[PDB]
Design a protein around this ligand. Structure first.
Ligand code: 0OH
Ligand code: CA
Ligand code: CA
Ligand code: CA
Length: 376
DNA sequence: AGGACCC
DNA sequence: CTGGGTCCT
C-alpha cells in the first residue's frame, strides 16, 4: 500500500552543536573547522559567501571576520546525533539513520492509528503543518491527502520535541517513500517542513538540474551516465533499459531508472546501535615506523573509552592512505575481549601495518584509521 | 579487501 | 579534501 515517510534533517549540524555550547557565537558568522576545511557553518556565515566543504583560505578571503571552532573530535556531535534518533525513536520505533544528522521514520502505522481515533466530522478540521510542495491544492476528500497532512502534523511534533528537549532545529519532508521525503525536506531551509502531495511528484522530480542530485547516484555512476548522453532526469527517465542494464549491471540500472521516476520501494529499517566504530586522522606526512606507532596508539585510546558500554567487537581493521586506500584485518583474541589492554593490541595492529607497508622501502602515508567491526 | 554510496 | 558511516561483490 501507500506509506507515509518523514525525512528529518538538522540545520547546519556541527555549527548548531557549537552554538548550543557557546551561545555567544549565535549572533556572529561561525564555521566548523577540520584540518584545512570548513565542513559546515551556521547560516550567518552562509549568506556572507562561506560554503560547506570550503578551503579555510578561501573562507578567510570571502569572510575575514569569520570565527572558527575546531570540530575534529566528533565526540560531542555523535552524542547529539543519537540523542536525536532516540527522541525520534519514541514517536515510532523504526528509525533509520543516514549519517549523523538524517533520520527516516516510517509514519504509516502512526497515521493510520490517528485517523481511526477521529470522528466522521472532525475529518475536515484537518490542516497542514508547514509548507505544501508546489503550493498544491489540498483535496480533503483524497484519503492519501488526509494521510500526508496527518504525517505533516506528526513531523511538526517531532520538530517541536527536538527543540523543546534538545534545543535543536531542522527540516522535515513528508512524502510517500524515502527518495521523495528526502528531496522535499530541503525545499525550505532552514527550520521549515514541506509535505509532498502525489500530483506534485513529477514537478519535484523534474525540478532537479543534474542527475547527481538524485540520492542514489553518486560520483562514479554520474560520470558513466554523462559519458552516455544522459544529462537530465528525463534523459535517464526515457533512456533504454537494456543498454543501461548492460552498462551498469541489471542491479543498479533498474534501480536508478526507477528512482528517476520518483519510485522507491525501499523500506525504512531500524538502524539500531552501530555496526562499526572507528577513529580517523589525516596529515601531510608520516614516513616512520615510530610515528605510525604513536598515532595508532591515540586512535586506539579514544576508541577504547568508546568501546566500553553495551557489546564488544570481534575484529580489528586498520586503514591507510598513501601519497585510493588499503586495509588489513584479523580477529581480536578472546581473552583480549575482556575489559590494561593497549599493549597486545598495538603489537597486532603493527603486524597488520608491516603486512601492508614495507619498512625497508620508502613510505608516505596521508591517513590512518583504526576500526572495530563485528560487535556482539 | 575493495567498491560504491551516504552525510 | 575531512571524519566518519552503510551496504554489496
Ligand atoms: N564531506 C564531509 N566530510 C566531513 N564531514 C561532513 C561532510 N559532509 C557533511 N559533513 C558533516 C558536517 C555537517 O554538519 C553534517 C551534515 O551536513 P549536511 O547534511 O550536508 O548539511 P549541514 O551542514 O549540517 O546543514 P544544512 O543542510 O542545513 O546546510 C554532519 C555532517
Ligand atoms: Ca542534508
Ligand atoms: Ca543537515
Ligand atoms: Ca546526491
Amino acid at each position: 500500500s501507500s506509506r507515509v515517510i518523514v525525512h528529518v534533517d538538522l540545520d547546519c549540524f556541527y555549527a548548531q552543536v557549537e552554538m548550543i555550547s557557546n551561545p555567544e557565537l549565535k549572533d556572529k558568522p561561525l564555521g566548523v573547522q577540520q584540518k584545512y576545511l570548513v565542513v559546515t557553518c551556521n547560516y550567518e556565515a552562509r549568506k556572507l559567501g562561506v560554503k560547506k566543504l570550503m578551503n579555510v583560505r578561501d573562507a578567510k578571503e570571502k569572510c575575514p571576520q569569520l570565527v572558527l571552532v575546531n570540530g575534529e573530535d566528533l565526540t560531542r556531535y555523535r552524542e547529539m546525533s543519537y540523542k536525536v534518533t532516540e527522541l525520534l525513536e519514541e514517536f515510532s520505533p523504526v528509525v533509520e539513520r543516514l549519517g549523523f544528522d538524517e533520520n527516516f521514520v516510517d509514519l504509516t502505522e502512526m497515521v493510520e492509528k490517528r485517523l481511526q481515533q477521529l470522528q466522521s466530522d472532525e475529518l475536515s478540521a484537518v490542516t497542514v503543518s508547514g509548507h505544501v510542495y508546489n503550493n498544491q491544492s489540498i483535496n480533503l476528500l483524497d484519503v492519501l491527502h488526509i494521510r500526508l497532512l496527518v504525517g505533516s502534523q506528526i513531523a511538526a511534533e517531532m520538530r517541536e520535541a527536538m527543540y523543546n528537549q534538545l534545543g535543536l532545529t531542522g527540516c522535515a519532508g513528508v512524502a510517500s517513500n524515502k527518495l521523495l521525503a528526502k528531496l522535499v525536506s530541503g525545499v525550505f531551509k532552514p527550520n521549515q517542513q514541506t509535505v509532498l502531495l502525489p500530483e506534485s511528484c513529477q514537478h519535484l522530480i523534474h525540478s532537479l538540474n543534474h542527475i547527481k542530485e538524485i540520492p542514489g547516484i553518486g560520483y562514479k555512476t554520474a560520470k558513466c551516465l554523462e559519458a552516455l548522453g544522459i544529462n537530465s532526469v528525463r534523459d535517464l527517465q526515457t533512456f533504454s533499459p537494456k543498454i543501461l542494464e548492460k552498462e551498469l549491471g541489471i542491479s543498479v540500472a533498474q534501480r536508478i531508472q526507477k528512482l528517476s521516476f520518483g519510485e522507491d520501494n525501499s523500506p525504512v529499517i531500524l538502524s539500531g546501535p552501530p555496526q562499526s566504530f572507528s577513529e580517523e586522522d589525516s596529515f601531510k606526512k608520516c614516513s616512520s615506523e615510530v610515528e605510525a606507532k604513536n598515532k595508532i596508539e591515540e586512535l586506539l585510546a579514544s576508541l577504547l573509552n568508546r568501546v566500553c558500554q553495551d557489546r564488544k567487537p570481534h575484529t580489528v581493521r586498520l586503514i591507510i592512505r598513501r601519497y585510493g586506500r588499503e586495509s588489513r584485518q584479523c580477529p581480536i583474541p578472546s581473552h583480549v575481549i575482556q575489559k590494561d589492554v593497549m599493549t597486545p593490541m598495538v603489537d597486532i595492529l603493527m603486524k597488520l601495518f608491516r603486512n601492508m607497508v614495507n619498512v625497508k622501502m620508502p613510505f608516505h602515508l596521508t591517513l590512518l584509521s583504526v576500526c572495530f567491526c563485528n560487535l556482539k
